[PDB]
Amino acid sequence: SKIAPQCQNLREQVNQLIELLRQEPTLRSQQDTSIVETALGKALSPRFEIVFAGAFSAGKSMLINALLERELLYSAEGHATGTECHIEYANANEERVVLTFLSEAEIRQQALILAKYLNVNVGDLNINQPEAVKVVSQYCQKIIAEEGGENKSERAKQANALHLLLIGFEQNRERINTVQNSTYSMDQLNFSSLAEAAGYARRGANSAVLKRLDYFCNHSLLKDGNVLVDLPGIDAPVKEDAERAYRKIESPDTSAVICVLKPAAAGDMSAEETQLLERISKNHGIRDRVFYVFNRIDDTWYNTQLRQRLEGLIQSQFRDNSRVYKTSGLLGFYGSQVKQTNSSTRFGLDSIFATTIKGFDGEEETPQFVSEFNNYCANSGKLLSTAFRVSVNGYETSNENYVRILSEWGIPLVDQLIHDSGIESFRSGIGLYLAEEKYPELFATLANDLQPLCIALRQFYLENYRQLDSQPKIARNSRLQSEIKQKIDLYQTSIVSINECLKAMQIFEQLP
């Protein structure tokens, strides 16, 4: 939210106060000013980066489409998110894709590390020679064949990673700078047809040449300076980009987390996810920020056992009932999309699934939404309590069973679907938290971390001057005492300004 003028001046006042503390070695050794300086850095809030770190194929990229109620991020079964990605606010005329390339220096360093692990006996990887690129990729292919297949061996996986990296550079030597990280853009006319297509081709390929794709977008969730960050599934075979995902989660460059967790589908927390929770716990202050989201909830509608397991898990480990949500992004995002559709469209079988509908032979094949919409109308869910006499016939195709239903019960029934999936709870909760809670919470935590610091300074000063007053040229002594006393008057002025900022923010845990 926008900054009141006292809160605008507060940066100077807090830096000045920290300098007044640093002046005395006793307080400098006693107190970790860096913590307050970091909390101030957050309070300045040029960004507030929300990280969707979560398990492999847990649907986190889908879930960001659910929060945006728009298709942006590419999403498929298996790995489809092999690169860090950002979404940021921009106005209608400003919507664009901005890439960011690794340099030759980085690509060469990575290729050298891979070759060393592979025991690829090659000298300087002068990939500026297509001949050398050919030789090294032939080595990689030979290794992959001798390992016997792309996942027969860790050596095969790393060889395939090197092979993809080399092919990426060969495709991109026009754009990769030797030392700089080149900036390159896709521009919006038909955002989906041109722009997002050129996006996923540089994303869903998992091409390691990029380290960032930025999307600029109008959706109001972005507008207040909040940046949605997506990350690969931390069970990625490219171990370094998973470790960089940990870097992005851990480093103060970010502080928000959404964890996307399998237990509804998996049945229990995986060691992959407990490692993530430990790494979150290690950060000094994130744990208050962090949310849990259970995804693929729909599988609990079908099985008693998974629903019992998940209930037991939530009531055991996850009492934080304001920070836990159940969702199925696949049903919510398409549900909202389906509400836009029309009967003449065939309810999104054109203009939504039009790519997926064309099968391996190009004939009509069922998009997953339809098979787990029919599995929601028949067989499962709560329609028993509605008026909807929905029924699904095994002598009609999977699409006819959908077109018929939506052609008569449709627009009412889609709201029953959405409110069963619960994305309207999740998007509501984040929409509330990111505007209303987060700005006060960042100022409240700043004031809270300042409170021991200010108490320590007040105690040190008052105990010194009570010691001096209890014990027993005056113009010199008074010049020193009045200079430090005027520093204390500045401390009082700054704390008055901070308390006025907090009062304007309706924060009452004010400083002494």
Next chain:
Amino acid sequence: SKIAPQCQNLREQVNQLIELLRQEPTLRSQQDTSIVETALGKALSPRFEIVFAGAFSAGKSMLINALLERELLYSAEGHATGTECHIEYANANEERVVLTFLSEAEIRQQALILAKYLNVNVGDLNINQPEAVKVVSQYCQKIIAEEGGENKSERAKQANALHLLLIGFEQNRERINTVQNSTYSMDQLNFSSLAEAAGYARRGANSAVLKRLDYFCNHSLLKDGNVLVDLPGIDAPVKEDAERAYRKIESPDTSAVICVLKPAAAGDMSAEETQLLERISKNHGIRDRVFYVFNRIDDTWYNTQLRQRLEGLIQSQFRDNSRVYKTSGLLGFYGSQVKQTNSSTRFGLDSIFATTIKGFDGEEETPQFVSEFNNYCANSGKLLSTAFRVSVNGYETSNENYVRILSEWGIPLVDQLIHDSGIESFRSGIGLYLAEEKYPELFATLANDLQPLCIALRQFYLENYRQLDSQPKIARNSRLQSEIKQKIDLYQTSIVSINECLKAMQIFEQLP
């Protein structure tokens, strides 16, 4: 299969031949007789242990019930297989459960290792004092609380493991011997009600006090000396019993493997599974034996993307079309069970699901078979090509939708289900391989590994004696030469006996 009398004598002949080789340091250094001795050890075949190593919740225990067409192994979502388990042939009067307990020495060693990792500052873990057991379990509970929940921390997981181990010993100090591994049994009257119930209570609890449960059973797949071994999911939180699973897979105590793989559900091979494939590859000879089984295939009926991914995976990595099978044990095993049921039963809603049907509140809740039977009759599958006008209604309960269908289309339709799931291919293929292929294959591999050994010996002997004959007391020299020549005559006799055994076995790669 039963052993012909030449093949019965072959053990002596092969040991004797190996001694004739060992006599000469040149061959002893040149050749690894231990390989042939191991192949002979397999050829003697007092056991042939088949190991169902495969991913966490990949359904391998279910799949063994599918191979047996009987319930034996406990099975649930999440971990439900926390212990090594064996199934062996016995006759109708002999069917029994045989446990095998860890000793006090092992339990104490494990508890000490855990306490050391936990930094539990306790002396000798004299768990013979219930007071000490109480103190250590209170430490474990306090640690788990400070970590903040059973999967908040690796330290929490290991504390919970120690807590379960201690409670297990407290429950079992009547039966645990201090140094010996106690043997204890459950005996069959109502095998399911008494025996298998007392089984899962010592299995599905994941109580670490046991290291083996043996089941003795009549099913013909066991009868020819083949022992089915089940193992925990190698992504177990108890790292040691996973490493022991690796021990059981790797060590010559076993040689057969069935890998049970998620990619239909997961979308790709996990690093968990590639580690397993590498560990299999490291064993010197298993790789010819090993089978791949894709399980949770049914999810590919619903999604085009998973079916395409799995087809691409199989055609890339898994050309071994006689060693790859697609299955869904959940549909096959219950399908065969359902065929036994009757309409008055309500087709297994009594006498099969009678435990599961009683919900958390005891009311009727849907067993997973019914929800992914209705999802197979409606919406998915191939019934389009059958006569069956099956339909599923959203205004009727999940059980009424099942009872109605089976009450009119039932017994025909269950065969369409089973032959879609394909368990009748898998059980047929293993049934053929374990009798017909395996016994010849073990003798053929024994003969093949003998063939370099016999060629090396023949070359060494003939090159020595051609050297001597090409160069230039005779009773002494001839006593030596004729003794070694009679050893060569014994070699000829043994190789004649082996070739006669192979001929009786219709094996034609015979020795010179």
